[PDB]
Design an enzyme around this catalytic site. Structure first.
Site, PDB file in Angstrom:
ATOM      1  N   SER A  50     -27.309 -57.679 -43.273  1.00 54.41           N
ATOM      2  CA  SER A  50     -28.463 -56.767 -43.308  1.00 54.41           C
ATOM      3  C   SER A  50     -29.625 -57.284 -44.143  1.00 54.41           C
ATOM      4  O   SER A  50     -29.468 -58.199 -44.924  1.00 54.41           O
ATOM      5  CB  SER A  50     -28.001 -55.421 -43.839  1.00 54.41           C
ATOM      6  OG  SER A  50     -27.750 -55.502 -45.230  1.00 54.41           O
ATOM      7  N   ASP A 155     -15.186 -53.771 -52.241  1.00 58.56           N
ATOM      8  CA  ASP A 155     -16.235 -54.711 -52.664  1.00 58.56           C
ATOM      9  C   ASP A 155     -16.865 -54.233 -53.995  1.00 58.56           C
ATOM     10  O   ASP A 155     -18.078 -54.264 -54.153  1.00 58.56           O
ATOM     11  CB  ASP A 155     -17.280 -54.889 -51.534  1.00 58.56           C
ATOM     12  CG  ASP A 155     -18.168 -56.130 -51.731  1.00 58.56           C
ATOM     13  OD1 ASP A 155     -17.780 -57.046 -52.510  1.00 58.56           O
ATOM     14  OD2 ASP A 155     -19.259 -56.138 -51.088  1.00 58.56           O
TER      15      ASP A 155
END
Length: 334
Positions: A50, A155
Site C-alpha cells: 500500500s 505484526d
C-alpha cells in the site's frame, strides 16, 4: 516424528463458537463508501502492500489517513477488512472509518481515523519509565481485546503502534497480517517483521497462536527499557534466532526444540553455537538504568520465553506489578 501439536492456552475456541460469518472473510461483501468524500493531502509512506496518505474528508474537514492497497487478491483484502470491522470500537484498536474504491488505482482504499503520531525513532529517545509502563499497558489492552475476539495481530512492532504523546493516546494499526485463530490450524510462518518474529516462526513451527504477539511485545519492551531498537537485530531469519540464542541461551532453545519435536533446518547447525543464558542486567548501562526496575526485568523475562505456551497472556501481563501505578492512575472516578 513430525512436531508435537499445540493449542492456545486461552481463547482457544472463541471462533469455534461464533457464527461462521464472523471469521469467514472470504464470504464478506464490502460496503463501499464514496471516494469523492476524500482529498489526499500528503504522502506518508509507501510499502509493498500500500501507499499511505494523510487526507481530508472534504464534507466535514476532518483529517483521516488513507491506505490505498496495491493490487492483491480479494481474499487478503477481505481478511483485513473483516478483522478491522470485528475489532472496531475495541480498546486502542485503530478505527476503520470508510472503505472506498480509489478512482485512479481502482483498488480498495481503507480510510482510518487520524492519530497525531510522533514517530517512534524520535519518541522512544524521550520516554520516561512511567511512559513505557503506560504505553505497554495500553498495547496490552488492544492485544487482550483482539485475542479475546479470536484474532492474532502477527505484526506487533513500533511502527504499528501509533502514539499521540500529548494526549497519552495509542492505537494498534496495520492489521494486514492478522488472522483468526482456529485450534489445530497450521499457519504461515512468514509473518511479523524480522526483529519481532517469535522463535516458533524462526524454527518453522506452524501451529502457533496469540502468544506470538507476546514475543513481539517483549521485543518492544526490551528495546524501550534498554534503549536499543530493535533489541534482537538479526541479519536474516536464521541469524535472528542466533541473536535470540546469544541472550536466552542455547540450553533452553534446545529444550524447546526437544519438547515440540522440531527438526532444525540443518542450516542452523554451524550457526547457533553454544551460548550461556545471560542475565538481563548485562544490558543495563548508565544511559538506560533509569528505565529498568526489578519489576520491568521480571515482566520482560516472562514474555521472552522460547516456549510460546509459557509466555504471559496479555491479561496475565496486565496484572503484573510493573503496571500497578498505571492501573491506579487509570482507575478514574469520571
Amino acid at each position: 516424528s513430525g512436531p508435537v501439536p499445540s493449542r492456545a492456552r486461552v481463547y482457544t475456541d472463541v471462533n469455534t463458537h461464533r457464527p461462521r460469518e464472523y471469521w469467514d472473510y472470504e464470504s464478506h461483501v464490502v460496503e463501499w463508501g464514496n471516494q469523492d468524500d476524500y482529498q489526499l493531502v500528503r504522502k506518508l509512506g509507501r510499502g509493498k502492500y500500500s501507499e499511505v496518505f494523510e487526507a481530508i474528508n472534504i464534507t466535514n474537514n476532518e483529517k483521516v489517513v488513507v491506505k490505498i492497497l496495491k493490487p492483491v487478491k480479494k481474499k487478503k483484502i477481505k481478511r483485513e477488512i473483516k478483522i478491522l470491522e470485528n475489532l472496531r470500537g475495541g480498546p486502542n484498536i485503530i478505527t476503520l472509518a470508510d472503505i472506498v474504491k480509489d478512482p485512479v488505482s481502482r483498488t480498495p482504499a481503507l480510510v482510518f481515523e487520524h492519530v497525531n503520531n510522533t514517530d517512534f525513532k524520535q519518541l522512544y529517545q524521550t520516554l520516561t519509565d512511567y511512559d513505557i509502563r503506560f504505553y505497554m499497558y495500553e498495547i496490552l489492552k488492544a492485544l487482550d481485546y483482539c485475542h479475546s475476539m479470536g484474532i492474532m495481530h502477527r505484526d506487533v512492532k513500533p511502527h504499528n503502534v501509533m502514539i499521540d504523546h500529548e494526549h497519552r493516546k495509542l492505537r494498534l494499526i496495520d492489521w494486514g497480517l492478522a488472522e483468526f485463530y482456529h485450534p489445530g490450524q497450521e499457519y504461515n510462518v512468514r509473518v511479523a517483521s524480522r526483529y519481532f518474529k517469535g522463535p516458533e516462526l524462526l524454527v518453522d513451527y506452524q501451529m502457533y497462536d496469540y502468544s506470538l504477539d507476546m514475543w513481539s511485545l517483549g521485543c518492544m519492551l526490551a528495546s524501550m527499557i534498554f534503549r536499543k531498537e530493535p533489541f534482537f537485530h538479526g541479519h536474516d531469519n536464521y541469524d535472528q534466532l542466533v541473536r535470540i540464542a546469544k541472550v536466552l541461551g542455547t540450553e533452553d532453545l534446545y529444550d524447546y526444540i526437544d519438547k515440540y519435536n522440531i527438526e532444525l533446518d540443518p542450516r542452523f547447525n554451524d550457526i547457533l553455537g553454544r551460548h550461556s543464558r545471560k542475565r538481563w542486567e548485562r544490558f543495563v548501562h548508565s544511559e538506560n538504568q533509569h528505565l529498568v526496575s526489578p519489576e520491568a526485568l521480571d515482566f520482560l523475562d516472562k514474555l521472552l520465553r522460547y516456549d510460546h505456551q509459557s509466555r504471559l497472556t496479555a491479561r496475565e501481563a496486565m496484572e503484573h506489578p510493573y503496571f500497578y501505578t498505571v492501573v491506579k492512575d487509570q482507575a478514574r472516578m469520571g
